[PDB]
Nucleic acid binder design. Sequence first.
DNA 1: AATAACCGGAAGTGGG
DNA 2: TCCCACTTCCGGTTA
Length: 91
Amino acid sequence: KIRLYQFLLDLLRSGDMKDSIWWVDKDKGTFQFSSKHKEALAHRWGIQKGNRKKMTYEKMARALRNYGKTGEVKKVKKKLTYQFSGEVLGR
DNA sequence: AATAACCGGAAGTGGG
DNA sequence: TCCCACTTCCGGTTA
Ligand code: NA
Ligand code: NA
């Protein structure tokens, strides 16, 4: 099953949910969620995963924070903004 | 207060 | 057995 960071990177590449997520500076790997439309993207993540409960942005971001230590995704000090690692961007 | 973004410990679920 | 990669729940902080 796909990993959350890859789900997000794939969305950014495909542009299929452009109103929910977008690059801030794609060269740096920085991206930002929509305040008003992030839940639709979270819902899609849960359905793609086959999870028992409805996925929420709160729970999705709880998972995102766990990447801080290993480094795949880090929180940026900007509203709803995160950053992929160079390794994630390359791989 | 109402709303929103952000936080993480702890325990549960999946598939190795 | 016991870690993976989250998920779910809860209580919380800051603006
Ligand atoms: Na929020
Ligand atoms: Na603010």
